[PDB]
Amino acid sequence: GPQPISRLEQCGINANDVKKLEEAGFHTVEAVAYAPKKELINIKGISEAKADKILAEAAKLVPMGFTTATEFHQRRSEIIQITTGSKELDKLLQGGIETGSITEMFGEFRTGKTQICHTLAVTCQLPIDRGGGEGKAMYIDTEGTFRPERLLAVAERYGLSGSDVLDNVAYARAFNTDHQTQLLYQASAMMVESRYALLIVDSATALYRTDYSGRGELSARQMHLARFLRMLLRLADEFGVAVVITNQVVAQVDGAAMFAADPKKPIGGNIIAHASTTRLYLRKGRGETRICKIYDSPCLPEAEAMFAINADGVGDAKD
Amino acid sequence: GPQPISRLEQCGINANDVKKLEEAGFHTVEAVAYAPKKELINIKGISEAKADKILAEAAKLVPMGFTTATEFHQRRSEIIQITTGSKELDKLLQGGIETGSITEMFGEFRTGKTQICHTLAVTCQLPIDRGGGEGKAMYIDTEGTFRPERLLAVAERYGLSGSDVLDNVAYARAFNTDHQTQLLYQASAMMVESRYALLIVDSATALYRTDYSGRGELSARQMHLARFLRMLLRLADEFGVAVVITNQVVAQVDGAAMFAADPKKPIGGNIIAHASTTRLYLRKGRGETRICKIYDSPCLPEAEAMFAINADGVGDAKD
Amino acid sequence: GPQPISRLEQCGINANDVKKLEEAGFHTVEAVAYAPKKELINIKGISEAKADKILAEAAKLVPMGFTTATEFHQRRSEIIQITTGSKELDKLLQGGIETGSITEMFGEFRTGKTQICHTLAVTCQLPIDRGGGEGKAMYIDTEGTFRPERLLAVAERYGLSGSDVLDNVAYARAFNTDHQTQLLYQASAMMVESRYALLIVDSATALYRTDYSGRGELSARQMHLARFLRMLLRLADEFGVAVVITNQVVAQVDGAAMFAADPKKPIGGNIIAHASTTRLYLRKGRGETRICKIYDSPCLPEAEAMFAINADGVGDAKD
DNA sequence: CCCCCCCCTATCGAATCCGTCTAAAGTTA
DNA sequence: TAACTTTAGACGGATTCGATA
Numbered sequence A, B, C: 001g002p003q004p005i006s007r008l009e010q011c012g013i014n015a016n017d018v019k020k021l022e023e024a025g026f027h028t029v030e031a032v033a034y035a036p037k038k039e040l041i042n043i044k045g046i047s048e049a050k051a052d053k054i055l056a057e058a059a060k061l062v063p064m065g066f067t068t069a070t071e072f073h074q075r076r077s078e079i080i081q082i083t084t085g086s087k088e089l090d091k092l093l094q095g096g097i098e099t100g101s102i103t104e105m106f107g108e109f110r111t112g113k114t115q116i117c118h119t120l121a122v123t124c125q126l127p128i129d130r131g132g133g134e135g136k137a138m139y140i141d142t143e144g145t146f147r148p149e150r151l152l153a154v155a156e157r158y159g160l161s162g163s164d165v166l167d168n169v170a171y172a173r174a175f176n177t178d179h180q181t182q183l184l185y186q187a188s189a190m191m192v193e194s195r196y197a198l199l200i201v202d203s204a205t206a207l208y209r210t211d212y213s214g215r216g217e218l219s220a221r222q223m224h225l226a227r228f229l230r231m232l233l234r235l236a237d238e239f240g241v242a243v244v245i246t247n248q249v250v251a252q253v254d255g256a257a258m259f260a261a262d263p264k265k266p267i268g269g270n271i272i273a274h275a276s277t278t279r280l281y282l283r284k285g286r287g288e289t290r291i292c293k294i295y296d297s298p299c300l301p302e303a304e305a306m307f308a309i310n311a312d313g314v315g316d317a318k319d
Numbered sequence D: 001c002c003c004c005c006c007c008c009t010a011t012c013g014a015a016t017c018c019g020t021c022t023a024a025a026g027t028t029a
Numbered sequence E: 001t002a003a004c005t006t007t008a009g010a011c012g013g014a015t016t017c018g019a020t021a
């Protein structure tokens, strides 16, 4: 795991400076080593000499140089993937949701995004040999659609206990964009004490549709969204967790020659499109069956799979 | 290749001055000869007389005068071009990616920038008669989307061995703009010992969108980006490698100007527009096919070509 | 042609003073006659009495008095103009590029500055009755985008010999502002022996953007630019060559008053604005067609024209 | 041949683009 | 017992420094 920030104290830094860094938002040596000088300067009690000394001391404990592709391949071969509860989706994703990156799921209503989030929140607590991540879960809720009964129903299927499954989920509700960004600092503070395997934001872009209204507020909205996504990436790199965000759709009214993937576009613009690593397009099939399509990925071919929303969570279609 | 800076000691320079120069970031005689006097002055242990003597000796060791266009033509006729793995793109570029200059590829998401980067990283190790550059590769990664399995697939396509292909790639991950600029000094130090042929930065402008937010920081952002591009150009000139960078896009919301010409504009502004030599525009086609268009070039006419992203890298569309 | 500085020996000047002046950078009687006293004083081996004697002899050898406007009209009616390869541009400029003055072309990327420079470099060698200048071309390259194949294409278009066209062009690459200024002394040295007709600097302000960074270095940058422009003007006056330089653009990010048309401004400021005699503004049209506009001139009305970039250089739009 | 002091002046020189949103409407035995 | 097409508007935003005889 990451090294606590207290190591800098014996590395040769004043305890007051470490305290100031702690209230700034940094809680590990890695978080300090990943920040630019201008971010540390903004702290009231930090001067240029203090900043460069802190950066030089932090750079010794964290490797930030060159390496080979063989070492990276060996390190990545030991990464953890979390099963989704459906064999078809697992085969489509070649194992399940990866850790250390950002995954995004978008689609129209009743397509099964909250259901997948609930199933993953339950599943991330299984032992590794059974397909789990063996950790706790964090659930930042934006719309107000969190239902623990679905968690209990999913936990019943895998033969776990309901009480300690509900004990391992942390829930928070965000009421505006400022609160949504503020919750991430407390999330970073919490992750040093225990071990977390998953962090869920649902929905990521729901409040930006209303907080910033017209074309006159577009640039500020995009800048705020970019800052939020950068913080999410920093958390994923620092703690090695899996981040799953949820998006919405918008219509195309120009009536031009676009008939593939329907006149549906995910909201957020180019910012969220470039930031995300994997994008999944969710569509409705027949009855309780849905269709999942690989929309964007650096290593996964474009394909399709079929799953269903059963009484015990997300599972294969019963035919 | 370039001359090591140790020759200045024989030319009559104190070894301590050479050590100071190496600590500053100059590892070859060419890097010293190309630097202005005010850059050498900034070093703590160098005076005006020492700078003048060093510059005089370096100029004595490097040809920096007038020549004839016939000699330039003869020298350029022996340049090395690296194939992209697609016949259509090779015909469009009249041979492939050209060393000694900066090439930029931009477009929206899943258009194929990272796939082309992986294919080039594998291909730059082929023998010259087979379309390669016969050298190692350097991959500075910004977003966290490096996947060695794609490298293994592309290597399997060409019949090479996976192990040494992975051994011949150097990987580094940048976490901020300062770290991204800092990695170039280590790259310059590395390139003296072994022969390289390609250097990928992907993405080159991803961290600038978030490190500097508003209009109040535009000037500093542009200055930092200009300095980074100048360092890249100096590396390309000194070592004769091919530099390939990757860019993103921004929307035009001003109104009903222009026409339906895909109102997407690359980011970076006039600095990156003027600095780049060749610019490639990537567009999404149908299925797995993509379209590449020549956006800017001093010797290549505007045209288009089609390629596909197959299971073994970038190649021609199978129709 | 100008009188070589060796003529002063017959006027009562020691060879020591003559070679000291030559080492200083003076190679003709006109150069000495136009220089102020303090410039001669700055030379180590020249005292005040020697400087006064040299100035008196030079003023004897060179006419520096009052004349009438009819004589000026008669001498100006014999001026030489070089065609640009396009009939409409020649009509706009009323003959072509004038010798003895400084012309500046600016615009954004792929607007056709380098193509025009290549076309002019080939064209300046045609016979006078064909629209040429009957001389050699000097090309000072700053960015590294010199391609002799375009020269070969234009020479093939005009039915010349490619070998001779390539042989009659002198090429030099500049790496910093100091080198850019230092190359002018060698240019002045070479212009004495052979008859040159064109001097191209492309780009003139590319290195000034990165060599001097912020507002703290504005004054030194502007003074260096002013000295460079003054030396260019001295060369144009002394040898009667045509001086064509290239500029870049910068965005305007405030004050939407009379600026909604085009928020593009050339760089360099009032120094280059006042120094330049004629300024041309290039725009992007449709396809391969571009638009040229008169931005500043002492004798030409403000108008517009249209040209195109073809496979054989700059020509007329094929409609 | 002898023994002690006086006083400021004058401005220069521009840079740097960003960021998408919004579905509607039945018809003809 | 089936096959059928058109439609248009909308805006705001901020900061930067050195140079002498």
Ligand SMILES: Nc1ncnc2c1ncn2[C@@H]1O[C@H](COP(=O)(O)OP(=O)(O)OP(=O)(O)O)[C@@H](O)[C@H]1O
Binding pocket: A108, A109, A110, A111, A112, A113, A114, A115, A116, A309, A310, A311
């Ligand atoms: N216990 C259950 N058994 C079966 N299906 C259920 C159960 N609970 C919910 N569903 C299904 O969940 C579907 C809605 O999925 P979900 O709540 O994930 O929507 P969503 O994609 O998040 O939508 P929105 O954009 O409105 O938030 C419904 O169509 C319903 O059939």
Ligand SMILES: Nc1ncnc2c1ncn2[C@@H]1O[C@H](COP(=O)(O)OP(=O)(O)OP(=O)(O)O)[C@@H](O)[C@H]1O
Binding pocket: A273, A274, A275, A276, A295, A296, A297, A298, A299, A300, A301, A302, B108, B109, B110, B111, B112, B113, B114, B115, B116, B309, B310, B311
């Ligand atoms: N093994 C594979 N087989 C087929 N297609 C693949 C494979 N791996 C990736 N792809 C394709 O690669 C595409 C994404 O391309 P790429 O990763 O180069 O995007 P990009 O241009 O770098 O985007 P971004 O701006 O998100 O970084 C996907 O659409 C996917 O279909």
Ligand SMILES: Nc1ncnc2c1ncn2[C@@H]1O[C@H](COP(=O)(O)OP(=O)(O)OP(=O)(O)O)[C@@H](O)[C@H]1O
Binding pocket: B273, B274, B275, B276, B295, B296, B297, B298, B299, B300, B301, B302, C107, C108, C109, C110, C111, C112, C113, C114, C115, C116, C309, C310, C311
């Ligand atoms: N052989 C050719 N045939 C047709 N067009 C060509 C040919 N070679 C180059 N071009 C055109 O030249 C254009 C670029 O022109 P040029 O190199 O003069 O640009 P520029 O304004 O000098 O740019 P920069 O600011 O980057 O230096 C491209 O848009 C390309 O279409």
Ligand SMILES: [Ca+2]
Binding pocket: A273, A274, A275, A276, A277, A278, A296, B109, B110
């Ligand atoms: Ca992406």
Ligand SMILES: [Ca+2]
Binding pocket: B273, B274, B275, B276, B277, B278, B296, C109, C110
């Ligand atoms: Ca360019």
Ligand SMILES: [Ca+2]
Binding pocket: C273, C274, C275, C276, C277, C278, C296
């Ligand atoms: Ca003028």
Ligand SMILES: [Mg+2]
Binding pocket: A113, A114, A145
């Ligand atoms: Mg939901």
Ligand SMILES: [Mg+2]
Binding pocket: B113, B114, B145
């Ligand atoms: Mg990518």
Ligand SMILES: [Mg+2]
Binding pocket: C113, C114, C145
């Ligand atoms: Mg050019």
